[model samples]
Target: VEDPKDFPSELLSFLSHAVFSNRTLACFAIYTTKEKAALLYKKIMEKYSVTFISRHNSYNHNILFFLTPHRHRVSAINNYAQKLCTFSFLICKGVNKEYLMYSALTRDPFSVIEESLPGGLKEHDFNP
Candidate 1:
């Protein structure tokens, strides 16, 4: 693997996209480039309201709010299933929304706005 600090901007964006779409990419990045992503993660974790407890000890926080619902094996599996379902629904909905949006834009006379642009409007661009 290439040095994480030497990664190109385009690759960084691609990695970011992958990281956002699935935590596996983020975890992999952290594992592969621990010195880089871990440092960044620590900095961001410090700035944010999020807690960055180790996975081993995250279950013992005294506050109810600090407790995650899926620390146990059964609850973790159930939570994983629920999250998968949610992700599936969102993916389907996102696709339908993109199709409708593209159809509306294409059906309009001002579809030329797309042509005038450099990137020509991709489906993922409308995610925001």
Candidate 2:
């Protein structure tokens, strides 16, 4: 799947609620190219204690899903992504009602302002 269509909607709703209640709880969706996708995936699975969630690929990119609990620092995630050469990532801000509304209304499973990494594409952020 090229989009978040296959991801569970209930999980998105739960993440939305979680974010609104506490800024610490967040989910990240990383989109990467095929060459580096599996490498990153293996690294994540082998190194980090994170939920696998789901993965989808289409044409030129592969999307990986990972959910981080409130205890895990966002900086850790950022650091990990930076090490891997991510194409772009979404921060699924829970506090932004507009972001949640757009996600809920559109039935999109993943919603966040896309942040492009170096040499990565800008598909679409917050400090935390």
Candidate 3:
């Protein structure tokens, strides 16, 4: 079956919409390799909280969005994140639709872009 596939949506796009353009809302993200995916995910939710989580490109890793502005504080999230190793975190300007759209459209081009995960290699992101 051949049909034009829909344009893919990057994770940050969903993040922007889900967080909306609230003046007080901001999102931070923590990324970890597959080896530490579940454990890092565990800590994020167990200690603080998160708004979204999903697998990265070609099962490279997993990303979890920390919508702390809606639950906690920026300082606290950063403090906790600073203790981890082999992990990375970045902030999502939830209220900045202008710059936010750029990331939503371009950042992590190889991530699990679609809202749902594909079943296997053929249907997954063209990373390999």
Candidate 4:
């Protein structure tokens, strides 16, 4: 999940099933600096079974996608994530709606940092 270059078809397959396919996923976007980010990453990997952590375009934070599918360890991890960062947000998507597979889900960690896209795509396309 960290190394996007090495991630090919299979990784994407697992990701699609976890995020799409009528499932509930709790995605946490944690904005913290370099050192602390790595620390929290370890803490989560050790504690959870169904989870994915990846770098954002900022390279300053990470997004941890947890498909607890369950016991609301969801709450515990959300609490854990907030304390480890300057700012963070959580999105828990229910099964019925269209899950937009936010850009960072498939974004490459080492690629150019991009929060905005070039003009070929725009607000009008999805919003208007």
Model 1 misplaced regions, further than 4 Å: 1-32, 53-128
- The parts of candidate 2 lying over 4 Å away from their true place are 1-22, 86-128
Give TM-scores for every candidate, taking all chains together and pairing residue i with residue i: 0.19, 0.43, 0.40, 0.39
Residue-by-residue lDDT tens digits, candidate 1, 40-117: 333323422222211111111110011111222222222332342331211100112332333333332313221223
User: What's the lDDT for candidate 2?
Assistant: 0.42
In model 1, pairs of residues that clash are none
For 8-55, candidate 4 gives per-residue lDDT tens digits of 232243232232234323443333444554565566555554333443
Q: Identify the candidate with maximal lDDT.
A: 2
lDDT of 2 at 123: 19
Candidate 1 displacement at residue 97 in angstroms:
24
Candidate with more favorable, higher lDDT: 1 or 3: 3
Error of 2 at 51 (Å): 3.0
Is candidate 1 or 4 superior in TM-score? Answer: 4
- Evaluation by TM-score, superior candidate among 2 and 4: 2
TM-score of candidate 1 against the unseen true structure: 0.19
> Number of clashes in every candidate structure?
0, 0, 0, 0
- Encode model 3's per-residue lDDT on 1-128: one tens digit a residue: 33212113354444333323324444455444444445555676656544333334323444443333154344455456556643343332232342343234324454443222233222132211
Pairs that clash in candidate 2? none
